[PDB]
Amino acid sequence: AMRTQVSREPFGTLDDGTRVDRWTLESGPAGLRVRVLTYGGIVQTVEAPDRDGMRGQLALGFADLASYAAHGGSYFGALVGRYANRIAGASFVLDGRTDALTPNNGRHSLHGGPGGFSRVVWDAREVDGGVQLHRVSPDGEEGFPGALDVRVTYTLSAGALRIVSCATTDAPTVVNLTNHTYLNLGGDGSGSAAGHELRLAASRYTPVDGTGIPVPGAPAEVTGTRFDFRAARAVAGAYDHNFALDGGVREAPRTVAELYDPRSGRALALATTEPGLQLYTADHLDGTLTGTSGVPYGPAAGLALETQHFPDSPNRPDFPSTVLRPGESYRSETVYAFSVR
Numbered sequence: 576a577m578r579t580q581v582s583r584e585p586f587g588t589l590d591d592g593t594r595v596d597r598w599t600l601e602s603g604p605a606g607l608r609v610r611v612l613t614y615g616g617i618v619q620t621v622e623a624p625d626r627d628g629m630r631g632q633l634a635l636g637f638a639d640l641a642s643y644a645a646h647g648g649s650y651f652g653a654l655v656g657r658y659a660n661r662i663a664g665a666s667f668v669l670d671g672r673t674d675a676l677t678p679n680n681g682r683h684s685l686h687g688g689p690g691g692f693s694r695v696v697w698d699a700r701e702v703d704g705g706v707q708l709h710r711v712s713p714d715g716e717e718g719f720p721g722a723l724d725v726r727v728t729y730t731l732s733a734g735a736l737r738i739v740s741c742a743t744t745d746a747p748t749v750v751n752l753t754n755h756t757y758l759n760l761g762g763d764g765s766g767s768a769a770g771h772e773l774r775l776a777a778s779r780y781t782p783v784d785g786t787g788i789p790v791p792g793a794p795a796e797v798t799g800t801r802f803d804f805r806a807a808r809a810v811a812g813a814y815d816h817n818f819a820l821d822g823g824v825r826e827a828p829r830t831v832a833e834l835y836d837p838r839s840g841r842a843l844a845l846a847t848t849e850p851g852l853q854l855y856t857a858d859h860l861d862g863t864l865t866g867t868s869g870v871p872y873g874p875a876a877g878l879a880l881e882t883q884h885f886p887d888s889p890n891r892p893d894f895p896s897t898v899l900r901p902g903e904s905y906r907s908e909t910v911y912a913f914s915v916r
Contacts (some may be wrong), residue, residue: 616654626840757877762867
């Protein structure tokens with residue numbers, strides 16, 4: 576392995592004039608190049624070699640800041656918070672108190688609200704092997720109680736990108752942070768990713784109603800259903816579903832997903848501490864947005880594998896708790912390890 580090179584350059588200004596920087600993490604031709612924006616903690620690009628050793632850009636994204644500012648609805652590459660995915664009715668109860676959120680997804684709250692973590696600028700500083708983003712989300716931001724002191728550290732070692740998210744709070748709150756990177760292992764401009772083979776270490780999933788809220792009941796078995804990825808197989812269909820990862824919440828990350836493109840030979844092993852994984856096949860994409868490789872993105876142009884706690888957890892005490900209290904430390908860790916076959 577070669578030493579990770581870290582550099583920072585201006586990436587432009589938001590409409591309100593806020594400056595945004597782009598951090599580049601580079602581990603050489605046999606490794607990766609990853610670029611991260613201080614805006615929304617966005618992973619703008621991920622480049623990795625194919626089986627012939629040729630570097631290619633894999634993440635769905637845009638070449639320019641203006642596109643991210645204007646089209647945040649896809650959450651391309653985004654650090655998502657304070658609460659990733661949906662809270663039913665844009666409301667929940669915590670310690671006897673009802674919290675009202677902005678209904679930005681029909682009746683529901685999605686991905687932390689209109690001004691969620693993916694649409695604010697983070698402070699950044701260099702650390703060994705990468706960049707650490709830091710921002711305090713004040714008490715009441717998007718309706719969530721408590722000032723949440725958040726640090727998200729992106730580091731690169733050879734072919735593996737590691738993202739560690741840490742937080743503390745000054746009052747009880749809920750927290751569920753993830754990264755919403757979509758990948759096409761054949762390249763973001765290569766067309767559909769539905770031919771990718773996916774294996775998930777998940778024997779159960781979270782069935783939902785038409786608006787993405789989990790129906791009453793324990794996670795359902797995947798056996799006999801279209802959600803069975805226990806053996807590697809083409810993604811093939813449309814998904815926007817949470818899987819209950821075997822083993823639940825873990826103190827150290829373990830491989831929970833393996834994604835593979837037979838054409839290029841690029842492989843991803845995704846490891847996480849999280850109990851859940853949202854698989855989303857980008858079906859909202861309609862060929863109108865031109866991505867970084869200069870090709871308009873159609874449905875399934877990339878796949879998002881978002882490690883997370885389960886949808887609607889603040890309204891579901893049967894799900895692994897997303898509550899954080901003063902004196903406690905929130906920690907989540909996900910590793911994207913690239914290789915070839």
